Design an enzyme around this catalytic site. Sequence first.
Site, PDB file in Angstrom:
ATOM      1  CG  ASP A 124      57.503  58.175  17.543  1.00 46.54           C
ATOM      2  OD1 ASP A 124      58.034  57.661  16.529  1.00 46.54           O
ATOM      3  OD2 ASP A 124      58.073  59.000  18.280  1.00 46.54           O
TER       4      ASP A 124
ATOM      5  CD  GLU B 196      58.252  59.104  12.605  1.00 44.54           C
ATOM      6  OE1 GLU B 196      59.108  58.681  13.400  1.00 44.54           O
ATOM      7  OE2 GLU B 196      57.609  58.379  11.835  1.00 44.54           O
TER       8      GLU B 196
HETATM    9 MN   LIG Z   1      60.266  59.319  18.043  1.00 42.34          MN
HETATM   10 MN   LIG Z   2      57.027  56.318  12.157  1.00 43.90          MN
HETATM   11 MN   LIG Z   3      59.695  57.068  15.060  1.00 43.90          MN
END
Ligand SMILES: [Mn+2]
Ligand SMILES: [Mn+2]
Ligand SMILES: [Mn+2]
EC number: 3.1.-.-
Length: 184
Positions: free
Chosen positions: A18, A114
């Site tokens: 992220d 994710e």
């Molecule tokens: Mn996330």
């Molecule tokens: Mn990513």
């Molecule tokens: Mn993500």
Amino acid sequence: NENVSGISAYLLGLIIGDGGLYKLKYKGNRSEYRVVITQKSENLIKQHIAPLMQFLIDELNVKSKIQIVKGDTRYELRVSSKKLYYYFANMLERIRLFNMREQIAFIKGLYVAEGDKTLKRLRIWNKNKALLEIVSRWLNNLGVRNTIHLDDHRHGVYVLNISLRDRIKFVHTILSSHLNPLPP
DNA sequence: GCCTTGCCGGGTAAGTTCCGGCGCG
DNA sequence: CGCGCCGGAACTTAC
DNA sequence: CCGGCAAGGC
Ligand SMILES: [Mn+2]
Ligand SMILES: [Mn+2]
Ligand SMILES: [Mn+2]
């Protein structure tokens, strides 16, 4: 140190997932090196992630600050630091050599970033197939069955699907693992 | 009968790089 | 002079 | 990421 190695791996899961690792070039031979984790939840950013980065920062005697920039759609935790940037980038390069402590922490971090968070299904999304294939092998070695395929034909995004047959082992051994926890 | 998982569109929660500063030997 | 930390946010898309 | 749809397996 194994508590630092694990927290590292976990943070590295969040970063690769992220955020990112940025080597910037500015005008006047100026430069910058950024370790970034972005996230929508203020509380997760400030109360869970930042204390972990802070701990790692102190233990590495990085003396950059933990910036938290509130943006449009999301909070950005940022550390501006050549030392910390290379710490994670070199750690990324040797991801294959991760021991079992690091593998589990990395997968946990990657999943917080994710993963399918409803846990109705167990799924990790990423355009980086090679990264997912590494996670797949680690998961296979932990007795967690999984398949990789192209989920999003529009954007080239793969999914790693964890078999619900190995549900309990995956969640219990990876997601809800009490290993290397903010000591205190 | 029931669970599992590939499929696929919606759109928000992410990611990336630009700016102008200041720090420091 | 030559790089490395701040603090921000416009901008785009990979989850 | 989310989430509904349908093919397929036992
Ligand atoms: Mn996330
Ligand atoms: Mn990513
Ligand atoms: Mn993500």
